[PDB]
Amino acid sequence: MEKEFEQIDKSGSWAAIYQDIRHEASDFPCRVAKLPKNKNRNRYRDVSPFDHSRIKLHQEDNDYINASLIKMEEAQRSYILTQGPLPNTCGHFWEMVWEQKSRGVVMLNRVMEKGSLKCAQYWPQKEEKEMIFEDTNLKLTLISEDIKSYYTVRQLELENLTTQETREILHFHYTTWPDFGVPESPASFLNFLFKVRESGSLSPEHGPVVVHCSAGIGRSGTFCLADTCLLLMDKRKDPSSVDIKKVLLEMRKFRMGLIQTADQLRFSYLAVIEGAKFIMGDSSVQDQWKELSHED
Ligand SMILES: O=C1C[C@@H](c2ccc(C[C@H](Nc3nc4ccccc4s3)c3nc4ccccc4[nH]3)cc2)S(=O)(=O)N1
Ligand SMILES: [Mg+2]
């Protein structure tokens, strides 16, 4: 994996490798996302879920949400990638979380980034100010949160106001990953990834984790590609058989544009190569990433 990396970095050809991927990427219809009535449900007109893998809300008036189910068969993990909720789609977002039985939500963006609005404030910031999404009959409450230097983990309680059933949802919020950018370091990224892994929110006993940034393709694509490559390296006989480009194209069969820049692709290589040390038996790298990430 690093031989390939070193030959690419050596030749300074990441832009060409990345562009080959875009050109070879699947192209499936997004007819439902394009219906006139769903316009105010899409943050960006050039970012849509394919009809074949879009997530359907259980309601009847309209079952559309700009979200895609990315199902990696060999890696044995599913992810729902979605855009940052819009003011009018926060209830839809939590309805999806509820109907798909997700246990965790991974947010890789901030509400405002460099003077631009990227996502609505869909979770409560204060314990005493819970949120009610009337349209979907859901109640959302901030139970507590653990604020680190580059990310925050929140414990939320989501309640179906109809049956009174409640469930705890974990919010993993990476607050320092720049749009069209990369994380500060492989160690800071992997520390975050493994926190999500250790929480149990990715366990198959739950619905797919819900991952989003602003459009649900760039930063979200990177997070998922890395997690999937590491899952594959841990399951196969030979972990050197993992081809990140092939994995990215496979993921791209489910949602368009995963990985928005050549440098995000390169970072993915680096994150996977570093994380491989934990797979190959190094029972100490995990603590090291924690230390190096300087989360306190
Ligand atoms: O790393 C990343 C890139 C982000 C991102 C944000 C927005 C868009 C869609 C946006 N479309 C749109 N942006 C706007 C803004 C105002 C009014 C209407 C529209 S459509 C977009 N398409 C672009 C094409 C070339 C270069 C930059 C672009 N940004 C894609 C990816 S992310 O949240 O998926 N993580
Ligand atoms: Mg307070």
UniProtKB/Swiss-Prot annotation:
Residues recorded as bearing Cysteine persulfide in the entry: 213
Keyword set includes Disulfide bond: no
Entry keywords, A to Z: Acetylation, Endoplasmic reticulum, Hydrolase, Membrane, Oxidation, Phosphoprotein, Protein phosphatase, S-nitrosylation
Residue positions, PTM Phosphoserine: 48, 240-241
Residues bearing the modification Phosphotyrosine: 18, 64
Major location (coarse): endoplasmic reticulum
Modified residues (S-nitrosocysteine): 213
UniProt topology in membrane: Peripheral membrane protein
Residues with Cysteine sulfinic acid (-SO2H) modification: 213
Cellular component GO terms, alphabetical: cytoplasm; cytoplasmic side of endoplasmic reticulum membrane; cytosol; early endosome; endoplasmic reticulum; endosome lumen; glutamatergic synapse; mitochondrial crista
Domain of life: Eukaryota
Role: Tyrosine-protein phosphatase which acts as a regulator of endoplasmic reticulum unfolded protein response. Mediates dephosphorylation of EIF2AK3/PERK; inactivating the protein kinase activity of EIF2AK3/PERK. May play an important role in CKII- and p60c-src-induced signal transduction cascades. May regulate the EFNA5-EPHA3 signaling pathway which modulates cell reorganization and cell-cell repulsion. May also regulate the hepatocyte growth factor receptor signaling pathway through dephosphorylation of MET.
Assembly description: Interacts with EPHA3 (phosphorylated); dephosphorylates EPHA3 and may regulate its trafficking and function. Interacts with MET. Interacts with NCK1.
Protein name per Swiss-Prot or TrEMBL: Tyrosine-protein phosphatase non-receptor type 1
Record lineage: Eukaryota, Metazoa, Chordata, Craniata, Vertebrata
Included stretch of the parent chain: 3 to 298 of 435
